[PDB]
Amino acid sequence: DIYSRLLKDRIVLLSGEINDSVASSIVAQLLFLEAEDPEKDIGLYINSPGGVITSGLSIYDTMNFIRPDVSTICIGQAASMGAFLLSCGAKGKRFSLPHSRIMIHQPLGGAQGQASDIEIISNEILRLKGLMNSILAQNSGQSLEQIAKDTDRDFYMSAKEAKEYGLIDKVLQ
Amino acid sequence: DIYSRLLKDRIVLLSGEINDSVASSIVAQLLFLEAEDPEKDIGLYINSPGGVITSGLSIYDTMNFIRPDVSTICIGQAASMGAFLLSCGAKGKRFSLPHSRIMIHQPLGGAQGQASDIEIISNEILRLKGLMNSILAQNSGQSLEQIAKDTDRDFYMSAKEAKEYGLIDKVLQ
Amino acid sequence: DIYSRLLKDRIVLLSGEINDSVASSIVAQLLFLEAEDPEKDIGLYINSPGGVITSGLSIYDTMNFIRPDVSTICIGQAASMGAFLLSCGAKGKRFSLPHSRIMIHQPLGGAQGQASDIEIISNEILRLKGLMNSILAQNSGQSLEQIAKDTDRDFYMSAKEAKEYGLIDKVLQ
Amino acid sequence: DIYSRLLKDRIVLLSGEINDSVASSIVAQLLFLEAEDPEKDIGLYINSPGGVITSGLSIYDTMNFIRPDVSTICIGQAASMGAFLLSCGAKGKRFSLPHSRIMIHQPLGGAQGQASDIEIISNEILRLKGLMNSILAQNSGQSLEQIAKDTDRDFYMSAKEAKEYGLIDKVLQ
Amino acid sequence: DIYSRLLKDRIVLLSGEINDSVASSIVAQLLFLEAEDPEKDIGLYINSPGGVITSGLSIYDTMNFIRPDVSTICIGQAASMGAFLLSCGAKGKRFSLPHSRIMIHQPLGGAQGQASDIEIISNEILRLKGLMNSILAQNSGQSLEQIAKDTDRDFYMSAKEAKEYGLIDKVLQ
Amino acid sequence: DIYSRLLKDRIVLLSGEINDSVASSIVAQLLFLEAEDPEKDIGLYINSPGGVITSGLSIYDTMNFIRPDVSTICIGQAASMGAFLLSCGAKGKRFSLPHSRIMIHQPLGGAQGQASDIEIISNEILRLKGLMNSILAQNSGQSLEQIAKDTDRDFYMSAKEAKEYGLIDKVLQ
Amino acid sequence: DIYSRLLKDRIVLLSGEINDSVASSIVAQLLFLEAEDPEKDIGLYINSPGGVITSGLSIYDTMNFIRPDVSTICIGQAASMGAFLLSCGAKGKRFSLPHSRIMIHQPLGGAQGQASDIEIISNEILRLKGLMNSILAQNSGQSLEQIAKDTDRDFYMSAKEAKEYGLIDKVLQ
Amino acid sequence: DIYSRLLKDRIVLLSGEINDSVASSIVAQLLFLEAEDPEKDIGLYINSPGGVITSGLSIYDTMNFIRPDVSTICIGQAASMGAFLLSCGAKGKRFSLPHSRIMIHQPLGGAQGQASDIEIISNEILRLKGLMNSILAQNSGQSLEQIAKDTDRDFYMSAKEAKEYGLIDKVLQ
Amino acid sequence: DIYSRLLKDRIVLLSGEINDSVASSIVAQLLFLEAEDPEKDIGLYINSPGGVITSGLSIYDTMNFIRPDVSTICIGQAASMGAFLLSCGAKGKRFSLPHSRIMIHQPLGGAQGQASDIEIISNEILRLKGLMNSILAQNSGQSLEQIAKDTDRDFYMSAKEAKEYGLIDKVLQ
Amino acid sequence: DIYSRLLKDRIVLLSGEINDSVASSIVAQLLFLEAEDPEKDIGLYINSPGGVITSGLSIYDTMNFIRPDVSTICIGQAASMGAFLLSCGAKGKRFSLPHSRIMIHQPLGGAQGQASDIEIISNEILRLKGLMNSILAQNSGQSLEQIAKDTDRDFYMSAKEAKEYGLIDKVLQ
Amino acid sequence: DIYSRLLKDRIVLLSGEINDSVASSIVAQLLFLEAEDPEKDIGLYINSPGGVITSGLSIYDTMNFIRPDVSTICIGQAASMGAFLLSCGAKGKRFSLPHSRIMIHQPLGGAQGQASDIEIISNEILRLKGLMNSILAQNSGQSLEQIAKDTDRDFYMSAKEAKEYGLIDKVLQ
């Protein structure tokens, strides 16, 4: 398994839509490495359009739970939770190839049922909105005010624009 | 046309699901019954599990628009919006057959999309929820807080119970 | 319309499953005949397996609501709510052709959702079970207990048998 | 209307499958004809493959319920309930065109659920079988055993054979 | 098998919807670790939106039927049965990464058929609601009433609030 | 025809979703009434959630095309294109029942294919947005830049709020 | 038929998509109106997104086949075949409401099968493409060259621009 | 795999619905263990809602066919056929976790076709309801009469209750 | 693997429709086989009805790209692109079995969209039609004209007729 | 694995449509080869109609990110992103077999939602278009304008033509 | 694998529908066995209802393309194409079990398109029809005219009858 083999070099590939099954796998790996050499570095390669908010968070929090440094690399794209996760790499170890697109937005959801329940989901997602649009600031150097304004709608950026934005550290040319 | 004939005796039947089409027909008959005689009472028999909120409000609001007195008579059942409408008939003229059932509740709906949009839909349906509980309290003599409490979940009642609650005036039994 | 010339003879056929649509057509025809002549009997021929409970009571209630006696004739079959309606015919004027089948049961239904929602629905359907079990008890002369025990499962019986049970008065053979 | 025109000559057509809808329509016509003239004969043509049991039973009963003689004419085909009805025609006036095919059998049906309900449905279908066999015996001149043994599986026969069996009186040819 | 890997370090993730298939895998793993060493701790990692009730109870009752202590870590989210199971982890050893979201509620279900069977099913869902709400009381220290009041509708809380609520001991902050 | 009779009194009903069918029906009705008597005001009752933009614009244009004043009365609701049309009637004659809700938004649409076609659609939908926003601003008295901001996301309003906003003139309380 | 009503004043409405049946109706109305009076003008209101090429040509020709001048009025929109048709109105009698949308373009289609069959179908649509461009240029004053360059991709324009462009003669405002 | 691993310890996990593929699987596992050590006990873990009847009986007979003692352990739930099989374990060796649930009932099924065939199936299922209720009576201490009564409709119960009832022996609390 | 042992002897089997993944497989097998020994001949058994053209030329070029002589052997059938490939085998080693059938034809395709895009695809398929006809005429010795006339419509051949057309060399019979 | 045996000689295959999954695999193999030897050249064979934009850009970047020279070889076809990728190979090492076909064009996409969301997408796709046009001009030596004009519509090329356009360096034959 | 274990004894199983996929495994297995030993014998056990003609011919020509004798044993059934293969077995070693059915028929197929195309398919299927009639005639020693007469419609035979008809040599009783 080419992934099994690459994982041997402490490399992890997050590819495509994020959800529990995939997010679990990432975590399973991250943990595995930490339980191999809790000292070294980890290479998280990200090419994702996003996905389940809580699924990505598990990945985010784990990237810190473990001891090893988690360096993120954007190849292809990092959209939504993919960008979020991307800006969660170890400060200084956050990169992107030259032609990757980085995009940031607000949470996406749905609610259905009695008014009471729609209010519960609405408040729950608005809550996740705030929680993430503050980490983005605390990860970019941008204020929550500016991070509130740019993510209102899809905010597309090129690698170079994301470095200058604070989502990444270096655009490996 | 059996219906067009009862219509000729000022009788209007609102049965089944409520939506724009069904409501536009009840509105028309109510405006028509008015032009035929803005003095004589209108008899509106109801057997409906509710439907679209705004469609329902189009009837309620037409009821109070035309000069005729709109008597409501619950046969079978009057649930949700149907229950709301029954309780909106001329004072002293809200009726129900003996074995009919009345059921009041909170509005239902849904939202899908960005956190921001879910929130807008969520507020709008809470605004409606408040609006109708307000009217529903004024029609039954209950306190707004009492209605908000009793409509939290589906509240069933017999013709007799509904009259004791203030939704109707008499049980033509 | 064949049903229109007959409506003149004051004949109303209840055929097939009952729902608000079908049930409104009946109620309207009864109100009509009532407006045409308040004293003359009405012949309600019933060939139905039943259906929506509130729709049924809608018809039953209208039946006792108007001034004319509503005679009921069972042709083919009167099952469930259809048998319920049969029994609600003017005392002394409940009939069935010789080979009609008559069955009595308990209400059927469905509930989906949170535990506390299923309970409200479970209770509402039990109330209707009790409510209708008693009216059957009256109509027939039988006692609550016997009625409950016999309707726990479908109780299939002949016309001659329904006569002895007290659901009809005479077998027009 | 071509059918309403023939109804004018006291001619009722019964074609295709039999269900409540169709049944309720034949009954309505039989009741209408008897209205106009309860003395004159009626021509009931039958090109049906059968259908709902209690549905045809309603027609059969309506045929003997009214005063007019209900003459039956089999054109094309009369199978299962279609045949049963054809034999319930006014004795002596049960006809058939030369190349029609009469077919008789036992009841078809289905049951699903708990064993208790399956037994109940099985006993009910069995009663119905019994009823119709003996009614077939009484109308044909056959013994409950010859009929029962002969309808265990579909029994197809021509007009001539149908007469020798005693289902029809004469073959109008 | 990246998972068969962690199963060595005594780790095990419960990810995604819970059902008899997943439940059997988790319980199979537990019985496995109880044999590899019936004293050392186990690391049941949680990221689930919930699932079937009796299924979750399979996991719970096993976490207690075995000797080793089953610690629980909430990564991503622990909603419904997931929060319920997160709280069933050996007291003192119930964790959650800083960004997880915990949510507790009441059982969900469905019932169809006779009013007798709806009631059977309604009583059982209520019983299951009674049991677990009770277990959520013993686990967190909350009273029977408090839990019931808060689980009526979806109760969303952060890791901190959940530790604060007594659902977990510590946030691996 | 209940709708016809009202049309004989200068009453047009715009209910439900808007499209070329419905749009043509109203245009057709407005032309007719203009021919009927080019002086008498026309009353356009609107209960619509919006629909095809070009369809909506053809009604608006016609409203100003014909000679007679076209008064609008919102009942139920006037959302999107409905709010637009509602505001397009003769000045001093734009009405709403007390409980009607108004909602103004930006246009919705879609495109697929090459970047050149998408770009072409985008500009076109962007051209439509500006036209209506300037006409909405031109109908209410708001500054174009004011409308642009409010309608960015769905803007719901009570009848009262809508009068103050300048969408309608009076609320028939 | 309100449409039959307006047809009484020589007013025809071409709304929605164009196909064989919408075209036969329009052409019938054109042949009928000619038989009615070969002198008086005909007003053709057009609100269409286009349709089947050959269907639109059947109308284009019939317009020019009968003696009466066929004036065209664009309400809502005149897209593609709809725009083509709009431009084919009698000289000086081509108008548009102020807010109408006008769009011209090249033919759409599909072919499947053998290489030879694709080529045949391809040559055919390039013929219709050439034919309609030529007529467009002739009706607008533009050159075949300009029309070709401009309809390469969807060319959207306002009423005031369709006049300048020469597709229409006057914007009724 | 995880399961197979537990197999060499003589644990057989009956999980999920029951059918011929799953049954032969259980059966095969039992035989093997038998062909292994025909003396050492077997721990049959049951957690299912039940399933095909002749299928379940095959796990049962086999369970008595071999010489080893097949202990049963309900985890999560043993409902219908699952509850049957649970109670069928070796005397004094039927356990269950504290929060597991047991439910016993009467067989469900169905038949389609001629009356003669529906009866054969009806009698065949009444037979199995009879067979299993007798075995269900022995295994627990109850009498056939007390089993036929309680199993009529779904009969749920706790672990303790199940013990009391006689379906299982000890409740490994 | 059976196919993997036959590969050992340098036998490559191409069966079924041809698409990118089937083609890639052959290419990978041709390439592999080239590394093992750039000298030893290869047997390419073909049993295909044809498939994607570019996929076919994929195999064709690889067949002439590698060093070793790739002999083709038609078993079952070689139709369309399958027959095309069959003739691209090294001259002298193009064999077929006594009852294989060879069918040659012109390309099949599809196109949808504007007249401009249809043309482009039309010319692209025609360019492929000529390119391939020219290669077939060259592979068989037939002239361009004669190959054209014959592939206009499907052309079926026996192994004998084939060889005598030039498509294959010898008939291994 | 025939594909893993090819990766051994340092040969990667890109067949069929391109999406995140397919791209992730290509990248992995590239990274693994740079691991197995950062000096030896890599041969990327392409038979693709293209696919997801960002997916392709992730391969292009990985290609230029690692040290090994990654030459490209077109078999069958390289169209859209496939062509784009082919031309991104190591200068001097871009190849194609004689009969494969190369086609270049502009990006394809979709947008649904509000005008604001449509616009953001249109701008983004025009953005990657300008990006890709620039990258194709640099790789082929063509001017940014010639590419823009040439890719407005599918531009099909033979291998020879492609090499002459500067897309591939050599045509193996 | 087990079908492979049997292949070690030169036993090839042909079960089910025949198609390229199926025929390819059979063809692969035949070529392999010869590579294993071109002297011994192969036993082709056939239990098939037939399939794709050219597919069958594929296995037919290989049986006789390889060196060893292909012994065909019928089990279950050899119908349509299945019987052709059975009969194509090595003269003298064709077998069958006592209760197998053998069935011979004419080819099945279809065509769609232009008359010219249907004719081409029609003649091709007639060719495959006469071709198999002649070979089936040879294999059995019957008259081309006789075989044609018996396969015009399905011709079922038992093993005894196949032996006397000439399709098999012996019947292993």
Short mmCIF file of C-alpha atoms in Angstrom, two decimals, chain J:
data_model
loop_
_atom_site.label_atom_id
_atom_site.label_comp_id
_atom_site.label_asym_id
_atom_site.label_seq_id
_atom_site.Cartn_x
_atom_site.Cartn_y
_atom_site.Cartn_z
CA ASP J 1 0.30 -6.06 -9.07
CA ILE J 2 1.06 -5.32 -12.75
CA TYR J 3 0.89 -1.63 -11.91
CA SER J 4 3.10 -2.00 -8.86
CA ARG J 5 5.57 -3.94 -11.01
CA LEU J 6 5.63 -0.98 -13.35
CA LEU J 7 6.12 1.50 -10.52
CA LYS J 8 9.19 -0.62 -9.83
CA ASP J 9 10.87 0.48 -13.08
CA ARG J 10 9.66 3.97 -12.06
CA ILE J 11 6.56 4.04 -14.29
CA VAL J 12 3.33 5.75 -13.19
CA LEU J 13 0.08 5.51 -15.18
CA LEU J 14 -2.65 8.18 -15.28
CA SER J 15 -5.70 6.73 -17.04
CA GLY J 16 -9.22 8.12 -17.19
CA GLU J 17 -10.89 11.11 -15.55
CA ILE J 18 -9.03 13.10 -12.94
CA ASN J 19 -10.53 13.70 -9.46
CA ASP J 20 -9.11 14.01 -5.94
CA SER J 21 -8.91 10.27 -5.42
CA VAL J 22 -7.09 9.63 -8.72
CA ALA J 23 -4.84 12.64 -8.17
CA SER J 24 -4.00 11.63 -4.59
CA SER J 25 -2.70 8.29 -5.90
CA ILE J 26 -0.52 9.84 -8.60
CA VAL J 27 1.02 12.25 -6.07
CA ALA J 28 1.63 9.44 -3.59
CA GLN J 29 3.52 7.42 -6.20
CA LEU J 30 5.54 10.55 -7.14
CA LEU J 31 6.46 11.17 -3.51
CA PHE J 32 7.34 7.50 -3.02
CA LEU J 33 9.60 7.49 -6.08
CA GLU J 34 11.42 10.63 -4.92
CA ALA J 35 11.92 8.58 -1.76
CA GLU J 36 13.09 5.40 -3.47
CA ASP J 37 15.59 7.52 -5.49
CA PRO J 38 15.67 11.33 -5.93
CA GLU J 39 17.81 11.12 -9.09
CA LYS J 40 16.37 8.58 -11.55
CA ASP J 41 13.77 9.97 -13.98
CA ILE J 42 10.04 9.15 -13.68
CA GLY J 43 7.79 8.27 -16.59
CA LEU J 44 4.22 9.57 -16.30
CA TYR J 45 2.01 7.98 -19.00
CA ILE J 46 -1.22 9.87 -19.72
CA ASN J 47 -4.47 8.62 -21.28
CA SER J 48 -6.98 11.10 -19.92
CA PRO J 49 -10.01 13.19 -20.97
CA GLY J 50 -9.12 15.35 -17.98
CA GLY J 51 -11.11 16.07 -14.84
CA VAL J 52 -11.32 18.20 -11.71
CA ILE J 53 -9.20 21.34 -12.07
CA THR J 54 -7.55 21.54 -8.67
CA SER J 55 -6.94 17.80 -8.79
CA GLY J 56 -4.84 18.27 -11.88
CA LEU J 57 -3.02 21.29 -10.48
CA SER J 58 -2.02 19.17 -7.50
CA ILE J 59 -0.21 16.73 -9.80
CA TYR J 60 1.46 19.49 -11.80
CA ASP J 61 2.83 21.04 -8.60
CA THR J 62 3.94 17.71 -7.15
CA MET J 63 5.64 17.03 -10.48
CA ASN J 64 7.72 20.20 -10.09
CA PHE J 65 7.94 19.92 -6.28
CA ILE J 66 10.09 16.78 -6.12
CA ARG J 67 13.60 16.32 -7.58
CA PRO J 68 13.29 13.46 -10.10
CA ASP J 69 12.65 14.52 -13.67
CA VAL J 70 9.10 13.57 -14.51
CA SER J 71 8.74 13.16 -18.23
CA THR J 72 5.28 12.66 -19.72
CA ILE J 73 4.11 10.17 -22.36
CA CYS J 74 0.68 10.48 -24.04
CA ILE J 75 -0.99 7.27 -25.15
CA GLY J 76 -4.56 7.33 -26.49
CA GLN J 77 -5.30 10.92 -25.48
CA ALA J 78 -4.44 13.85 -23.20
CA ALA J 79 -7.30 16.32 -23.29
CA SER J 80 -8.14 19.34 -21.20
CA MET J 81 -6.34 18.78 -17.92
CA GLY J 82 -4.68 15.78 -19.50
CA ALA J 83 -3.09 17.95 -22.16
CA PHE J 84 -2.30 20.64 -19.61
CA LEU J 85 -0.47 18.01 -17.58
CA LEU J 86 1.31 16.49 -20.53
CA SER J 87 2.83 19.89 -21.41
CA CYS J 88 4.01 20.29 -17.77
CA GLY J 89 6.52 17.46 -18.09
CA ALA J 90 10.27 17.99 -17.88
CA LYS J 91 11.24 20.24 -20.76
CA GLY J 92 12.84 18.12 -23.45
CA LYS J 93 11.08 15.03 -22.06
CA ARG J 94 7.44 15.40 -23.14
CA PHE J 95 6.37 12.60 -25.47
CA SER J 96 3.45 11.12 -27.32
CA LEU J 97 2.97 8.03 -29.44
CA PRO J 98 2.12 8.81 -33.08
CA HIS J 99 -1.65 8.23 -32.94
CA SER J 100 -2.78 9.64 -29.61
CA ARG J 101 -4.67 12.91 -29.71
CA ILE J 102 -4.17 16.10 -27.74
CA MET J 103 -6.92 18.65 -27.06
CA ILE J 104 -6.84 21.89 -25.08
CA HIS J 105 -9.68 24.14 -23.93
CA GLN J 106 -10.98 26.50 -21.25
CA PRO J 107 -12.21 25.46 -17.79
CA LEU J 108 -15.75 24.12 -17.28
CA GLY J 109 -17.86 24.62 -14.18
CA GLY J 110 -21.08 25.47 -12.41
CA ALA J 111 -22.74 27.94 -10.06
CA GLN J 112 -26.05 27.97 -8.24
CA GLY J 113 -27.36 30.36 -5.62
CA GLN J 114 -27.54 34.11 -5.16
CA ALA J 115 -26.08 36.53 -7.68
CA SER J 116 -23.29 37.13 -5.11
CA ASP J 117 -22.41 33.47 -4.99
CA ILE J 118 -22.65 33.15 -8.75
CA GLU J 119 -20.27 36.08 -9.26
CA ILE J 120 -17.72 34.75 -6.83
CA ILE J 121 -17.64 31.44 -8.74
CA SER J 122 -17.48 33.01 -12.19
CA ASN J 123 -14.54 35.18 -11.11
CA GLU J 124 -12.80 32.15 -9.63
CA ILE J 125 -13.13 30.00 -12.73
CA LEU J 126 -12.03 32.91 -14.95
CA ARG J 127 -9.12 33.22 -12.53
CA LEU J 128 -7.86 29.62 -12.95
CA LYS J 129 -8.50 30.06 -16.66
CA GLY J 130 -6.16 33.06 -16.88
CA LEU J 131 -3.81 31.04 -14.71
CA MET J 132 -3.87 27.96 -16.94
CA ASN J 133 -3.68 30.00 -20.13
CA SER J 134 -0.48 31.56 -18.77
CA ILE J 135 0.99 28.20 -17.81
CA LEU J 136 0.18 26.70 -21.19
CA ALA J 137 1.81 29.64 -23.00
CA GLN J 138 4.99 29.25 -20.95
CA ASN J 139 5.11 25.47 -21.52
CA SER J 140 4.46 25.68 -25.28
CA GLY J 141 6.24 28.92 -26.08
CA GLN J 142 3.00 30.29 -27.52
CA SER J 143 1.74 33.75 -26.58
CA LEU J 144 -0.89 34.26 -23.89
CA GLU J 145 -3.14 35.44 -26.70
CA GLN J 146 -2.74 32.58 -29.15
CA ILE J 147 -3.64 30.22 -26.29
CA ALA J 148 -6.67 32.28 -25.30
CA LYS J 149 -8.04 32.28 -28.84
CA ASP J 150 -7.18 28.62 -29.35
CA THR J 151 -8.77 27.23 -26.24
CA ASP J 152 -12.05 29.18 -26.41
CA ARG J 153 -13.39 25.91 -27.85
CA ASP J 154 -12.10 22.34 -27.85
CA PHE J 155 -8.90 22.48 -29.89
CA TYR J 156 -8.03 18.94 -31.04
CA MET J 157 -4.49 18.13 -32.17
CA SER J 158 -2.61 15.10 -33.39
CA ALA J 159 0.72 14.26 -31.71
CA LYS J 160 2.66 15.88 -34.56
CA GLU J 161 0.51 19.01 -34.44
CA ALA J 162 0.82 19.09 -30.66
CA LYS J 163 4.61 18.89 -30.87
CA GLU J 164 4.52 21.66 -33.44
CA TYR J 165 2.38 23.74 -31.07
CA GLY J 166 5.06 23.28 -28.42
CA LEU J 167 3.02 20.98 -26.14
CA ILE J 168 5.19 17.88 -26.49
CA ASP J 169 8.89 17.67 -27.27
CA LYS J 170 9.00 14.38 -29.18
CA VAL J 171 6.89 11.75 -30.95
CA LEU J 172 8.24 8.24 -30.36
CA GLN J 173 7.46 5.96 -33.31
#
